[PDB]
Amino acid sequence: VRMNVLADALKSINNAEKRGKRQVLIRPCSKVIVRFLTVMMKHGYIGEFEIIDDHRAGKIVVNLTGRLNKCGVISPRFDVQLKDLEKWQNNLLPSRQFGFIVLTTSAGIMDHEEARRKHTGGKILGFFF
Amino acid sequence: MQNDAGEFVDLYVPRKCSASNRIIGAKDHASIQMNVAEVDKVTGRFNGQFKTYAICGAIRRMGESDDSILRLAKADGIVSKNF
Amino acid sequence: GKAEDKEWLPVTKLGRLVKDVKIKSLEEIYLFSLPIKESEIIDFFLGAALKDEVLKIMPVQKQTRAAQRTRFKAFVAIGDYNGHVGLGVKCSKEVATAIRGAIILAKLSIVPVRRGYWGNKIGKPHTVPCKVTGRCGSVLVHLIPAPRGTGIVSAPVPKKLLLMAGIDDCYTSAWSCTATLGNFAKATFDAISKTYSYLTPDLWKETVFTKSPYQEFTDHLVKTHT
Amino acid sequence: GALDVLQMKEEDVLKFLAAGTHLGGTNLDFQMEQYIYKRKSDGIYIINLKRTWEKLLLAARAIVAIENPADVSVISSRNTGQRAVLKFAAATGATPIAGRFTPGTFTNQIQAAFREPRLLVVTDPRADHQPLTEASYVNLPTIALCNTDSPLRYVDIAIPCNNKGAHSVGLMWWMLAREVLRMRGTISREHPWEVMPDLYFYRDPEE
Amino acid sequence: MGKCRGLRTARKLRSHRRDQKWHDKQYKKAHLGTALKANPFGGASHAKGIVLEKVGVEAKQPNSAIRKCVRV
Amino acid sequence: MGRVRTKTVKKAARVIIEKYYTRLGNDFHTNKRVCEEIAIIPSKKLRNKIAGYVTHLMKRIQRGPVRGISIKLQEEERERRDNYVPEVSALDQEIIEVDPDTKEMLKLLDFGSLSNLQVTQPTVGM
Ligand SMILES: [Mg+2]
Ligand SMILES: [Mg+2]
Ligand SMILES: [Mg+2]
Ligand SMILES: [Mg+2]
């Protein structure tokens, strides 16, 4: 079935970090997975990643640093509107000095710190810290 | 760890494992600090300078420090290549 | 009168390098995760500030052919109020020696706790650096940072180790059979111990590797006590 | 090593094939899989020699870096390795332990057998498991000679060899003594060694 | 072992909670109406009455006394 | 019945043997006097029991060595056998020889002389 593709991509990344692996393969690939990985890599929680291209949905190989502590998904994509955001990042995040919430806004997939910097709400996807 | 003035307010900076990047706690009585020697490149005799490696207790308990030191050495000219 | 007490003839390599002034602080011991097996190593560095506290005395007993054979279990917490804390427990036949053997274990189990800032970094960290959890047999203890001045919002028992550890502000939570003091105290101690074993983006700088205290002082150990 | 002074010479491959050290066991475990060349036509694995040599020189480089020679405690419990460890400790000044181990020698501060080593060499991970389990309490690295069916738990520098036959075990200890004494200074290279490997072999009670 | 998380399941969640509240003892006792009927007070805190005759209720086994109640 | 000696008797006899090994013989009435003069046994029955176990141990030390007493004469015969002996030689013939897939291995690390071959039946137990 695989209702949600991002959920199992993130759970398979997170099951390997607990194990000390240097790399993972995750499949199928998707547009939202690549954007979420780019957001997670711009900050420095993962290394580079490579996309393997079959003529189907494809597969990704990720180089894992040892910096990632936990990444995860919020199961229904709730609407979040720049006033709920503080009450959201007081449940999901472990502190006020690190850890990011990832949300899709009409200006792309980004983090909360940029969402407030651009005055935009959207839908929550997940978090990593 | 610093503050807005700039000083460092911290008891100590714990070391991190060289194979999994996770810090080594203060009560991990299974972590080691293996120290290997450097040779003098001509007659193959020891000369002072040496290399040091830390391995955490967990990955030492799963039987993986063996093939992790081999990789930390091969990456670093103690073994060069062609193991 | 008589004088010249000469206790603590060491029996371990670390006792030698501690009693001889070669080693400076127990932070240099924690950096190398060595096991402290002599209770005088603690009183060398700390000792002028370590205050102990008897958390509970609990009479346990075994049924026997003749009798019920009772003996008492003492839970003692210890630690100076500036970043070190420990918790020991000993079961002995009489109270006076249980309370004395428990202080030894409470001193031997001293760990360093990490403190951080809640909102902004003005100086002298006051609270835990992140949300931490700790368990001991169906007792879960959640520690959460708090703004400056809120005190410790917790039960009486965790707000006796939290104080000793040096934390000024903390939001706490529990969800368990917390009425058993042993598991409550051990879970709080575990949550505090997990405060330096949590990777945090300021702990990403690669490690500079120093000489072990056994490698630096090989020449001493070779013949300092004999 | 990557160099040519440390490379294996033709005189040592003959010592290897004469002692039989390349001949593995019948079972393989998934951690020793990088040391095997190929399984023979009958069910037995050949150990790669070039890999034995590199792991043996890595163990020598780990032993030479310890300053006090007398906290490199060496242990053997089986009857085949006792003479070898006694002669290895004699040749380079370690402290040997042959026979029973008397658990608690590393973690008990009353016993008269209590020592605090800085390394640990051992003949067979699966027969001297007590020193390994105890080293896992006091931050103690470990070197070990591994058969193809050796569990690599708590060992840090495995050396692949036939671990079963007396000639193999003595040859490996003899070569470990040769290479520590060589790179510490002492018996400089470009000479054969006075000692012959047969001083290190098991007795196997005689005629 | 399973609960509907989806975005249009507010009716199922609300109806299941409303259905299951009726298994809480105090909730049912307060919202059914049988206790307010069986309560010898009309749901009041105090009540006046007439004394029929005094009685001698004997206490339960681990104690011994005669508790001296009245019948109102 | 009994006649099972106690640890206080056995340990005493073992120490007496391990120190005064050369004064003790094979007869009982002389070992009795020897142990009487070298030690202090505060009884006569204990003296006889210790001197009677000493004789039973001596009758055994003349054979193979026991595993609780260490003497000088019986250590040399170990020491002088743990050092090399002409029963052993070098590697017994230095023309030792191998099978295929070892020569195929040796070829991958540049070896080229003094070997042999054989091929087996094609699987175990045939
Ligand atoms: Mg209760
Ligand atoms: Mg029902
Ligand atoms: Mg009821
Ligand atoms: Mg209720």
Curated annotation (Swiss-Prot), chain A:
What the entry lists under PROSITE patterns is as follows: RIBOSOMAL_S8
Determine if Secreted is one of this entry's keywords: no
Alphabetically list the UniProt keywords.
Cytoplasm, Nucleus, Ribonucleoprotein, Ribosomal protein
GO terms under cellular component: cytosolic ribosome; nucleolus; ribonucleoprotein complex
Task: Write out the annotated subcellular location.
Answer: Cytoplasm; Nucleus, Nucleolus
GO terms under biological process: translation
Q: Which residues carry this modification: N6-succinyllysine?
A: 87
Molecular function (Gene Ontology), one example: structural constituent of ribosome
Role played: Component of the small ribosomal subunit. Part of the small subunit (SSU) processome, first precursor of the small eukaryotic ribosomal subunit. During the assembly of the SSU processome in the nucleolus, many ribosome biogenesis factors, an RNA chaperone and ribosomal proteins associate with the nascent pre-rRNA and work in concert to generate RNA folding, modifications, rearrangements and cleavage as well as targeted degradation of pre-ribosomal RNA by the RNA exosome. Required for proper erythropoiesis.
Provide the family line: Belongs to the universal ribosomal protein uS8 family.
Summarize the subunit comment.
Component of the 40S ribosomal subunit. Part of the small subunit (SSU) processome, composed of more than 70 proteins and the RNA chaperone small nucleolar RNA (snoRNA) U3.
Entry-linked PANTHER family: 40S RIBOSOMAL PROTEIN S15A
Name the chain's protein: Small ribosomal subunit protein uS8
Q: What is the lineage of its organism?
A: Eukaryota, Metazoa, Chordata, Craniata, Vertebrata
What is the name of the gene encoding this protein?
RPS15A
From Swiss-Prot, chain B:
Q: Which UniProt keywords apply?
A: Acetylation, Cytoplasm, Endoplasmic reticulum, Isopeptide bond, Ribonucleoprotein, Ribosomal protein, Ubl conjugation
Q: Name one GO biological process term.
A: cytoplasmic translation
Identify one Gene Ontology CC term for this UniProt entry.
Answer: cytosolic small ribosomal subunit
Tell me which residues bear N6-acetyllysine: 81
Q: Which Pfam family, giving just one, matches this sequence?
A: Ribosomal_S21e
Compartments, as annotated in UniProt: Cytoplasm, Cytosol; Cytoplasm; Rough endoplasmic reticulum
In which family does this protein belong, per the annotation?
Answer: Belongs to the eukaryotic ribosomal protein eS21 family.
Molecular function via GO: structural constituent of ribosome
Q: Which InterPro entries did the record assign?
A: Ribosomal_eS21, Ribosomal_eS21_CS, Ribosomal_eS21_sf
Assembly:
Component of the 40S small ribosomal subunit.
Does this UniProt record's set of keywords contain Cytoplasm?
A: yes
Name of the protein this chain belongs to: Small ribosomal subunit protein eS21
Quote the function comment for this protein: Component of the small ribosomal subunit. The ribosome is a large ribonucleoprotein complex responsible for the synthesis of proteins in the cell.
Organism name? Bos taurus (Bovine)
Cross-link annotation Glycyl lysine isopeptide (Lys-Gly) (interchain with G-Cter in SUMO2), location: 41
> Which residues get modified to N-acetylmethionine?
1
Curated annotation (Swiss-Prot), chain D:
The range of the complete sequence contained here reads 3 to 209 of 295
Q: Which family does it belong to?
A: Belongs to the universal ribosomal protein uS2 family.
> Which cellular compartments is it found in?
Cell membrane; Cytoplasm; Nucleus
**Species in which this protein is naturally found:** Oryctolagus cuniculus
Region Interaction with PPP1R16B: start-end pairs:
52-111
Q: List the residue(s) that the UniProt entry marks as the site Cleavage.
A: 113-114, 131-132
**PTM info:** Acylated. Acylation may be a prerequisite for conversion of the monomeric 37 kDa laminin receptor precursor (37LRP) to the mature dimeric 67 kDa laminin receptor (67LR), and may provide a mechanism for membrane association. Cleaved by stromelysin-3 (ST3) at the cell surface. Cleavage by stromelysin-3 may be a mechanism to alter cell-extracellular matrix interactions.
Q: Under the GO molecular function aspect, what terms does this record hold?
A: laminin binding; laminin receptor activity; structural constituent of ribosome; virus receptor activity
Gene encoding it? RPSA
Q: Identify the domain of life.
A: Eukaryota
Using the record's annotations, give every residue carrying the modification Phosphothreonine. 95
- Name the UniProt key words of this record, in alphabetical order: Acetylation, Cell membrane, Cytoplasm, Host cell receptor for virus entry, Host-virus interaction, Isopeptide bond, Membrane, Nucleus, Phosphoprotein, Receptor, Repeat, Ribonucleoprotein, Ribosomal protein, Ubl conjugation
Q: What else is known?
A: This protein appears to have acquired a second function as a laminin receptor specifically in the vertebrate lineage.
Q: What is this protein called in UniProt?
A: Small ribosomal subunit protein uS2
Phosphoserine modification sites are 41
The location annotated for the cross-link Glycyl lysine isopeptide (Lys-Gly) (interchain with G-Cter in SUMO2) is 87
One cellular component term from this protein's GO annotations in UniProt:
plasma membrane
UniProtKB/Swiss-Prot annotation, chain E:
Residues recorded with modification 3-hydroxyproline: 62
Q: Which domain of life is it from?
A: Eukaryota
BP GO terms, sorted: translation
Its transmembrane ranges are none
Q: How is it modified after translation?
A: Hydroxylation at Pro-62 affects translation termination efficiency.
The leader peptide range reads none
Composition bias (Basic residues) maps to 1-20
Where is this chain's protein located in or outside the cell?
Cytoplasm, Cytosol; Cytoplasm; Rough endoplasmic reticulum; Nucleus, Nucleolus
List modified residues, type N6-succinyllysine.
54
Region Disordered: list its residue ranges.
1-26
Q: Where is this cross-link: Glycyl lysine isopeptide (Lys-Gly) (interchain with G-Cter in SUMO2)?
A: 37
* A single GO cellular-component term on record: small ribosomal subunit
Task: Give the molecular function GO annotations.
Answer: structural constituent of ribosome
Keywords associated with the record: Acetylation, Cytoplasm, Endoplasmic reticulum, Hydroxylation, Isopeptide bond, Nucleus, Ribonucleoprotein, Ribosomal protein, Ubl conjugation
Its family remark reads:
Belongs to the universal ribosomal protein uS12 family.
| Quaternary organization | Component of the 40S small ribosomal subunit. Part of the small subunit (SSU) processome, composed of more than 70 proteins and the RNA chaperone small nucleolar RNA (snoRNA) U3.
Query: What is the protein's known function?
Result: Component of the ribosome, a large ribonucleoprotein complex responsible for the synthesis of proteins in the cell. The small ribosomal subunit (SSU) binds messenger RNAs (mRNAs) and translates the encoded message by selecting cognate aminoacyl-transfer RNA (tRNA) molecules. The large subunit (LSU) contains the ribosomal catalytic site termed the peptidyl transferase center (PTC), which catalyzes the formation of peptide bonds, thereby polymerizing the amino acids delivered by tRNAs into a polypeptide chain.
Q: What is this protein called?
A: Small ribosomal subunit protein uS12
Give the residues of the full protein shown: 1 to 72 of 143
